């Protein structure tokens, strides 16, 4: 079957931004590395990709609300006000600036606050993860399902490191989580792009994933992908506010629950709210 | 063209093995891999890729010695006895068997025990890292240089987690190492194929890399890549027995030096000085 029109618009915007990013990494040097925060980089490439995405989206839907990582939140109008696009124009910026070919464009659409459409596009490997609510998820058109692994034994987990200065107070907490997972699992991977970690959970390439400190645009599309592939997503307390709180556990049925339980004893009260 | 004939032979062998591995991953992605069947699938693909490589190598140099991960060590004859091929037919097998598209073929040639030729091939992204002693290193034909970063400030490091049972007593040491690096660096990455981690050091994509528990076929090609790109490679004590001891630091000049210094306080004072 073919995609709903809105998912199609999102996918074409993602493709255009990804071709810009790929042209950059392939043949150019980065000519702008500003710094939004410490270790939080913004490039001419991030802004150009964001402008590409927003131009396509507003060409199709001028009354929708837009929340871009670089541009912030801009409300819509009329009926269009119930639609909110959540855009990471380039997820994996540190990878990108170093030339590490692992990063993605991430675009989600929420209707009345509920995830409705999702695109995660890796323009190097040309991998297009798409999903719509109640429609399943797909990689380049083929339907995705979370893995069948029944426990953490032999699992391949994805994760993200608490690298920011303002996370130092939780670093040891995280390293304890990590520690208790090394024995049973087959491996833990930190490839450096949260949207692709979620997409990999959705495709069955990772059995589960956990990270704190994330922003909404990092997670929105990938969370819809995981949900539509038959998986589970929550925050560190098991509730549905992972987008607002920035801590997230995603995974297949049993590995999600097992990882959530496993991280429980190493949670600071700041991540138990 | 510019490659010495021995390097070109190794490159074509890597290409054929990588095409085989790529078709294999494509077929495993559309079927459910039993946990009992995963090891058998991996042994199959491993041995088929090794056969591909070894047939191609011996068609050109039948008197050379061969050392494959799957097949062990087989001596050569005549002057060919001074040539030893060190082959990992599939670096990143846990990724592979989970469908994570990050893995590579690794082929090195040693002449009287010194690294002479090297190929690391990513068959998904189609990235061919090549080097010969005294000839420099290339990615798909373009010359490679290690990065110029002067310290670990803002550095992107590669690493490999100590996931094996026999590394358990080192786990804490590793997590101590890791911890001391979080403040300065912009990120740490564990993508799951040590040959590609070394190749990324050589291309300037990582500023430095460290890991222990490796085997010779994991490191041989990538170490030559780093050296020929202008970088530095050593074991944890700073000597050049990384191939034999299994622990390795590689980097650009300054980040190699800083990373080696950083890891010294977390070394068991004995075998590792
Ligand atoms: O900065 P960015 O590259 O857009 O987005 C994120 C990346 O997905 C990274 O994998 C994650 O670990 C960081 O927490 C985020 O910053
Ligand atoms: O078994 P393999 O996948 O061929 O090689 C792996 C090594 O065993 C190493 O321990 C791991 O950290 C690397 O990511 C891979 O190179
Ligand atoms: Ca960011
Ligand atoms: Ca991101
Ligand atoms: Ca971003
Ligand atoms: Ca291997
Ligand atoms: Ca290997
Ligand atoms: Cl691991
Ligand atoms: Cl990091």
UniProtKB/Swiss-Prot annotation, chains A, B:
Keywords in alphabetical order: Chaperone, Cytoplasm, Hydrolase, Magnesium, Metal-binding, Ribosome biogenesis, RNA-binding, Transcription, Transcription antitermination, Transcription regulation, Virulence
Gene Ontology MF: a single term: metal ion binding
Protein EC: 3.1.3.25
Database matches in CDD domains: IMPase
Binding-site positions, Mg(2+): 69, 88, 90
Knockout or disruption consequences: Decreased expression of T3SS genes and effectors. Loss of cytotoxicity against human lung cell line A549, avirulent in a mouse infection model. Down-regulation of flagellar genes and up-regulation of T6SS structural genes and effectors, increased biofilm formation. Grows less quickly at 37 degrees Celsius. Decreased susceptibility to antibiotics neomycin, streptomycin, gentamycin, spectinomycin, ciprofloxacin and ofloxacin. Increased ribosome stalling on leader peptide PA5471.1 mRNA, leads to increased expression of PA5471 and up-regulation of the MexXY efflux system.
A single BP term in Gene Ontology: ribosome biogenesis
The organism's place on the tree of life at top rank: Bacteria
Family annotation (InterPro entries): IMPase, Inositol_monoP_metal-BS, Inositol_monophosphatase-like, Inositol_monophosphatase_CS, Inositol_monophosphatase_SuhB
Inducing factors: Transcription is strongly induced during mouse infection.
SUPFAM superfamilies: Carbohydrate phosphatase
Localization of this protein: Cytoplasm
Catalytic function, reaction form: a myo-inositol phosphate + H2O = myo-inositol + phosphate
Binding positions for substrate per the UniProt entry: 69, 90-93, 189, 218
Cofactor: Mg(2+)
Keyword Lipid biosynthesis: no
GO cellular component, one term: cytoplasm
PROSITE patterns, per database record: IMP_1 (PS00629), IMP_2 (PS00630)
Subunit composition and interactions: Homodimer. The rRNA transcription and antitermination complex (rrnTAC) consists of RNA polymerase (RNAP), NusA, NusB, NusE (rpsJ), NusG, SubB, ribosomal protein S4, DNA and precursor rRNA; S4 is more flexible than other subunits. Interacts with the ribosome and with RNA polymerase.
Family of this protein: Belongs to the inositol monophosphatase superfamily.
UniProt function note: Part of the processive rRNA transcription and antitermination complex (rrnTAC). The complex forms an RNA-chaperone ring around the RNA exit tunnel of RNA polymerase (RNAP). It supports rapid transcription and antitermination of rRNA operons, cotranscriptional rRNA folding, and annealing of distal rRNA regions to allow correct ribosome biogenesis. This subunit may play a central role in organizing the structure. A ribosome-associated protein, deletion of which alters the expression of 494 genes, suggesting a role in global gene regulation. Involved in control of pathogenesis-related genes. Required for the activation of virulence factors associated with acute infections (type 3 secretion system, T3SS) while suppressing virulence factors associated with chronic infections (biofilm formation and type 6 secretion system, T6SS). It probably acts at a post-transcriptional level.
Protein name: Nus factor SuhB
Organism for this UniProt entry: Pseudomonas aeruginosa (strain ATCC 15692 / DSM 22644 / CIP 104116 / JCM 14847 / LMG 12228 / 1C / PRS 101 / PAO1)
């Amino acid at each position: 079957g073919s995609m709903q029109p809105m998912l199609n618009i999102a996918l074409r915007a993602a493709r255009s931004a990804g071709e810009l990013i790929f042209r950059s990494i392939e043949r150019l040097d980065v000519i702008s590395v500003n710094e939004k925060d410490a270790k939080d980089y913004v490039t001419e490439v991030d802004r150009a990709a964001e402008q590409t995405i927003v131009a396509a989206l507003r060409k199709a839907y001028p009354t929708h609300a837009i929340m871009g990582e670089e541009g912030g939140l801009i409300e819509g109008s009329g009926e269009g006000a119930d639609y909110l696009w959540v855009i990471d124009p380039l997820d994996g910026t540190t990878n990108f600036i170093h030339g590490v070919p692992h990063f993605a464009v991430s675009i989600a659409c929420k209707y009345k606050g509920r995830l409705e459409h999702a695109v995660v596009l890796d323009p190097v490997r040309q991998e297009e993860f798409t999903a719509s609510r109640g429609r399943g998820a797909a990689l380049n058109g083929r339907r995705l399902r979370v893995s069948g692994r029944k426990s953490l034994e032999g699992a391949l987990l994805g994760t993200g490191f608490p690298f920011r200065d303002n996370q130092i107070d939780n670093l040891d907490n995280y390293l304890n989580m990590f520690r208790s997972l090394v024995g049973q699992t087959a491996g833990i991977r930190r490839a450096g792009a949260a949207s692709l970690d979620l997409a990999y959970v959705a495709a069955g390439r990772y059995d589960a994933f956990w990270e704190f400190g994330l922003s909404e645009w990092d997670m929105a599309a990938g969370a819809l992908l995981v949900q539509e592939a038959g998986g589970l997503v929550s925050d560190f307390t098991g509730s549905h506010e992972f987008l607002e709180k920035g801590h997230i556990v995603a995974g297949n049925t049993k590995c999600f629950k097992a990882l959530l339980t496993t991280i429980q004893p190493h949670l600071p009260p700041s991540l138990k709210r």
